[PDB]
Amino acid sequence: CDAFVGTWKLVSSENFDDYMKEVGVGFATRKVAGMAKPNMIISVNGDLVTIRSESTFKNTEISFKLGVEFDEITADDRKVKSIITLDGGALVQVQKWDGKSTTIKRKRDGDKLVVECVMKGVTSTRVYERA
């Protein structure tokens, strides 16, 4: 997963609001989240991968090992069970909570970092590029 290492700036966002609405994000915070242009900083240290997101909305940080389930408090304050795998060359994270389930795909496409968030059909696409 050395292809993901680095600092990335958000450059585009599509259907994010629809996605947040689906996960059950409140109207107010949903707008504050949408106006944010985060700086995802992926890093690795041994078998531990760390994805740090810095936004005007909320700074989050998750450190994990691949294929090993972990606990996470999402930005929208959901308490979920996560597991990240390197599937088909892409960092595939699936979040399970209250019987519900969302998947977050992080894949490289040229010089871009494409993030696909899926929740019951709805798909949000956010593209990043090296800062």
Added chain:
Amino acid sequence: CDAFVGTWKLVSSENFDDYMKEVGVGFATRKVAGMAKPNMIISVNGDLVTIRSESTFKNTEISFKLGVEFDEITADDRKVKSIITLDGGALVQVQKWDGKSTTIKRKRDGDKLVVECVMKGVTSTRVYERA
């Protein structure tokens, strides 16, 4: 995943034939497979986990890292894409091939090693115990 390390003997098997039939295993080999009492030998060396199965049917060996997709030629000669994770304290392996998908769960239940194989509803249960 140190709870899985060791040598294990098969002690029981339920609905295995139904499971094999579902994955598309031929009648003849399906019977030869069912008459086998394999010795699953799980081992670890650093970040590499190796599951060695020894049977009168066919000796298979897979070495892998958790959360990292790998190529595997199953005992019944299927060429699949596998990914093993430590989900909910259990070694959860999912095999993808030709649009189809089977999942193999390996969990500890007391002094036993329970293997649950699922393929479109059908579930096979094989219990092992330290040799």
